[PDB]
Design a protein around this ligand. Structure first.
Ligand SMILES: Cn1ncc(-c2cc(Cl)cc(Cl)c2)c1CC(=O)N1CCC[C@H](C(N)=O)C1
Ligand SMILES: [Zn+2]
Length: 140
């Protein structure tokens, strides 16, 4: 589990969105596994606006933050799960690192701010849904 709290927005994995998230919906995209809902309180996270390929992510199944090198956001084939059929997920970055089901939502960050959240994993790989291109998260 986990979310990014930037301005009056809450960014979560779409597959983990609550009824309150859907009832206060700002934007969602199944192909990216992302959903953004509105919040009453202002958040403290800042979004990175950069092309960093190195950062640190939070792994809840180890209570640890790990430094990683990650690929550029791309279209990648993801196997079937209880949440989606096997399909291509867009804006996904891969890295070598531990991840289990339950680790989705962990933040990946670089020197500039939040880069994205854990969305996929398996056998020593971890995949992050990028949010750096969502410029509108910084305003309104
Ligand atoms: C986060 N994580 N880390 C490891 C595994 C994983 C490991 C094993 Cl052994 C078996 C399975 Cl089915 C999954 C997962 C879960 C995962 O990748 N997904 C399930 C939730 C929706 C995700 C999506 N974005 O499509 C895909
Ligand atoms: Zn950066």
């Amino acid at each position: 589990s986990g979310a990014i709290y930037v301005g009056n927005y809450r960014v979560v994995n779409r597959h983990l969105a609550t009824h309150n998230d859907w009832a206060n919906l700002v934007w969602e995209d199944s192909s990216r596994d992302l959903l953004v809902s509105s919040t009453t309180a202002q958040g403290c996270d800042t979004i990175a606006r950069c092309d960093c390929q190195t950062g640190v992510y939070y792994c809840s199944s180890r209570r640890k933050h790990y430094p990683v090198s990650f690929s550029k956001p791309s279209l990648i084939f993801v196997e079937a799960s209880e949440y989606y059929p096997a399909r291509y997920q867009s804006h996904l970055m891969l890295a070598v690192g531990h991840s289990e089901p339950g680790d989705c939502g962990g933040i990946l960050r670089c020197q500039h701010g939040v880069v994205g959240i854990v969305s996929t994993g398996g056998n020593g790989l971890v995949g992050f849904a990028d949010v750096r291109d969502l410029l509108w998260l910084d305003e309104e």
